[PDB]
Amino acid sequence: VRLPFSGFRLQKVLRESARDKIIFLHGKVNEDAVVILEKTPFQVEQVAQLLTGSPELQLQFSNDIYSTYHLFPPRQLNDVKTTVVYPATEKHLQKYLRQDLRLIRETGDDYRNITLPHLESQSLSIQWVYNILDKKAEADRIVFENPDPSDGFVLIPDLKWNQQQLDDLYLIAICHRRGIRSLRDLTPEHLPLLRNILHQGQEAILQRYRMKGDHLRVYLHYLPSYYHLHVHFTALGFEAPGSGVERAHLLAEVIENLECDPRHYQQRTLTFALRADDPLLKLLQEAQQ
């Protein structure tokens, strides 16, 4: 009947997805509440009966054999799944919050003059990466390894993939070689490594999980989440966060770019998104005005 509090005043949309028809709202009450609203899937019988029984339809437009409408269905199709977290702690607000993103186009020179110095101004640990590579941690999770210290890598499932089905298959290849921070460091010297990751990684997944290479999206992030070269292997059906064109770069194309254009990744402009509160965004914007 009633929500477990009084007087909802919106502070912030923590996250919204128009694709998934879901929104996460931070509201002030009286104290903090999170309310999550999600539209519901259609039930076939409910739609089929609506379409034969006086539906309230209103034209947005038509063109040839196509027409689009606003439909206002009866109550049974209008359920909205509503999840209330109250009181919400700062941890709740942080787990749901996603910053709005802005696109930047970074020239080779912007990288050299602005981005790289900004990265060098930070002290970020990747010791967790080295512990895996050195077999001190997570050795039991490695699915495949090419042990070569120059051209080798380990393949490990993503932590959030429960390995309970192939629909959301997701593994990460991490190279043994140290000091390759991102796409920007890649030269023809790295072709053997990159080929190994692509071919051996796909083969390992075929053997272990019986998933063929043409069912795999294999790509790198730019900007990456940590600055030691790593490659994502996801089921093609799994539209994983970070597989968008504004972040993802297909390993096969990275290889072919290096093969025909050796300085590609030092010379060409790369496009990525930054959180609107990221100080790097302001630096690149200031440098580009």
Place this chain on the structure above:
Amino acid sequence: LPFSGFRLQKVLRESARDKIIFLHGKVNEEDAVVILEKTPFQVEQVAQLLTGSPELQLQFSNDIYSTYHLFPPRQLNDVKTTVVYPATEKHLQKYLRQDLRLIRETGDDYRNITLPHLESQSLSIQWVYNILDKKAEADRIVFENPDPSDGFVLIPDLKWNQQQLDDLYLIAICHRRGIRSLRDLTPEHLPLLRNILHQGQEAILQRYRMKGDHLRVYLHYLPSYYHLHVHFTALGFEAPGSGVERAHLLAEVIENLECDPRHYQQRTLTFALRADDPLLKLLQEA
């Protein structure tokens, strides 16, 4: 509706993630496809509802967590409904759920396998020509450069109900005829591509107040229809075919052509095909 008496033949496709359903029905007893999609939330109106007397049913509760059924007022329950009628067999197969496989098409694969296979088909883009010729949707045009060679029409895509900016989605359709896809692009088309990118973004800034750094602007390969068009989408929208395996950023298409005139004839392109697509077999064979 453009017909009477929808009799369900088949659920062609459904998604619980996207809250969408595709139905094949018999009408006027003719085939029709009807597509129903739940709409994005109206944030301020939802917040207004929550602070009032929303109609709720408690499904379960455990200390700080509770789950409800909310039944909003009529104005918040809009379902975007798209009708394809009369629907051909191509339409019925197109919307059928199907498994996708990736393929890497070399420049020679395209010329010797894909293009002949395309050229062999007879596909209608009458809706596209109706927009360009002002026979349909003329009132909906957001921006036009009418130059027959380097010009285009910018128009909200069918996908977008225009009711919120979170899923902002327009298409630029070039006036020039016979540019089928990426594969046809050469430096000849650079003025057109530049016009689309810069005039398209300026139009969106003026109309919607959305800056270029809030947009993801890209082409599809393979395209769903073979007349060059560009997708202008909110960066925050997980937009159709915006994945790396389909989307090509317009700015990069332009720069690729500037660096290598034959880029899109010579280079290998990667894209997904449906398992039941005969092109997939033809390419795998070759």
